[PDB]
């Protein structure tokens, strides 16, 4: 077992004395191991906390090129590298509090008036997160210790989440405060949630923890090492016509395929050769099916949605459509009759520049699929191939603007 250089519990639970004592030494500590270039991007932090983490959570969805070219992706680079820098040793348990909004609960919990929470409130809550994976992302700032009398408490829901061991973490001071900052990027689980009292007011003090998963975002080169990894063998694990269905199908079978299955074609006019091409890329993907939690990225359209491009409802400029999409898509199980394209890299792609959503999927470890890119000759960008027939659950939509053209984020977990 490792000694840390300053001992500390895993949660400091309502010992803010305690914690704020822990979080100024390893401050002073971590100040240490920083670099010029880090320590200056901490000073850029304290200013504009609220642009830089905006940034931290949407800059993964552009353009690879796009990146490199942002004003604010040096700023990003720096910050991400001075809390990498300091992986924490064992877990965790960080406080903050959330908007019952970040987890699609569209109903006021309690007014800033109320002390009480309702039982009706309490319930509702909890059967709006339970069973759900939800993702974090972007620059936080987040507690070591529960918030007391005399600490800031800006909602009625208090997250009280366990960050798992090796999790980057940046203690630092800001004038006379010490606060500690932290990246996200993973999926949270709330599995109970408890009725709270802190200073004669209710709070939900939701119990989260992190649900590890692979997501390589933007860093399309650590995915592709990692899909070649598990399918580099792949093609040896098929039969000759599996390999044979599902080269053709990549090499452009898929337009008669998928179009033969969204239009309910094995059903309305048979198809037998279709049939057996669709039966071995199927069985391809069920033969080393996804050995870890992955997130993977899908530019989707609007027919995908039951919408057109002419379609009003489309246009997420209008804010009142993309309430209208959130209040008709989240919660929501999503089906797909075809096989999805998806890739490892969250990055906008020539072809798919207009597509106003991305699907963000967390395929779940031991689920049917491959990584077709282990394969060469594929038009096809850093892809994951997903069986016919899935359904992902939408758990949350957040919306960002790729220049003049808003988008939306879909954070969907494929269901077992
Ligand atoms: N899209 C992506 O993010 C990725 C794409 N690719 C590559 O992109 C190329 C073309 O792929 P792509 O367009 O994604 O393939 P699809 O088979 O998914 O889509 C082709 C057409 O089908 C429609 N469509 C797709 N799914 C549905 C659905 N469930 N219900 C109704 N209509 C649907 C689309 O319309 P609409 O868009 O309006 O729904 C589109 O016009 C391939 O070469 C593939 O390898 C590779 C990796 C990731």
């Known amino acids: 077992t490792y000694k840390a250089p300053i001992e500390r519990p895993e949660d400091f639970l309502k010992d803010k004395e305690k914690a704020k004592e822990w979080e100024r030494k390893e401050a002073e500590r971590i100040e240490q191991k920083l670099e010029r270039s880090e320590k200056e991007a901490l000073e850029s932090y304290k200013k504009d906390s609220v642009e830089?983490?905006?940034?931290?959570?949407?800059?993964?969805?552009?353009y690879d090129y796009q990146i490199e070219a942002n004003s604010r992706e040096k700023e990003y680079k720096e910050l991400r590298n001075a809390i990498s820098k300091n992986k924490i040793d064992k877990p965790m348990y960080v406080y903050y509090f959330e908007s019952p909004e970040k987890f699609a609960f569209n109903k006021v919990i309690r007014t800033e008036n109320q002390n009480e929470i309702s039982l009706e409130k309490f319930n509702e809550f909890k059967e709006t997160i339970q069973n759900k994976l939800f993702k974090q992302d972007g620059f936080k700032d987040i507690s070591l210790?529960?918030?007391?009398?005399?600490?800031?408490?800006?909602?009625?829901?208090?997250?009280?989440?366990?960050?798992?061991?090796?999790?980057?973490?940046?203690?630092?001071t800001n004038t006379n405060n010490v606060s500690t900052l932290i990246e996200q990027g993973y999926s949270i689980k709330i599995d109970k949630i408890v009725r709270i009292v802190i200073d004669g007011k209710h709070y939900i003090k939701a119990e989260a923890s992190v649900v590890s998963s692979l997501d390589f975002k933007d860093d399309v080169s650590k995915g592709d090492s990692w899909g070649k990894a598990?399918?580099?063998?792949?093609?040896?694990?098929?039969?000759?016509?599996?390999?044979?269905?599902?080269?053709?199908?990549?090499?452009?079978g898929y337009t008669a395929i998928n179009?033969?299955?969204?239009?309910?074609?094995?059903?309305?006019?048979?198809?037998?050769?279709?049939?057996?091409?669709?039966?071995?890329?199927?069985?391809?993907?069920?033969?080393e099916p996804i050995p870890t939690n992955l997130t993977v990225y899908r530019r989707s359209g609007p027919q995908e949605f039951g919408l057109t491009l002419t379609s009003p409802e489309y246009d997420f400029n209008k804010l009142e459509n993309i309430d209208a999409f959130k209040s008709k898509w989240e919660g929501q199980a999503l089906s797909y009759p075809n096989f999805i394209f998806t890739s490892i890299g969250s990055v906008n792609m020539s072809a798919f520049a207009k597509?106003?959503?991305?699907?963000?999927?967390?395929?779940?470890k031991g689920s049917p699929g491959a990584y077709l890119s282990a394969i060469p000759g594929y038009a096809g960008q850093?892809?994951?191939?997903?069986?016919?027939?899935?359904?992902?659950k939408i758990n949350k939509i957040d919306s960002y603007k790729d220049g003049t053209i808003?988008?939306?984020?879909?954070?969907?977990?494929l269901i077992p």
């Open 355 to 364: 597509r106003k959503i991305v699907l963000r999927i967390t395929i779940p």
């Open 382 to 392: 850093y892809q994951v191939l997903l069986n016919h027939g899935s359904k992902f």
């Open 230 to 252: 598990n399918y580099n063998d792949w093609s040896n694990k098929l039969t000759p016509n599996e390999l044979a269905d599902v080269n053709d199908y990549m090499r452009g």
């Open 259 to 287: 179009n033969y299955l969204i239009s309910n074609g094995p059903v309305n006019n048979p198809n037998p050769e279709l049939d057996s091409k669709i039966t071995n890329i199927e069985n391809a993907l069920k033969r």
């Open 52 to 62: 830089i983490s905006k940034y931290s959570q949407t800059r993964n969805y552009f």
């Open 406 to 413: 808003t988008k939306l984020i879909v954070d969907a977990t």
């Open 145 to 172: 210790y529960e918030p007391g009398k005399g600490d800031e408490k800006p909602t009625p829901l208090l997250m009280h989440l366990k960050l798992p061991r090796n999790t980057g973490m940046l203690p630092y």
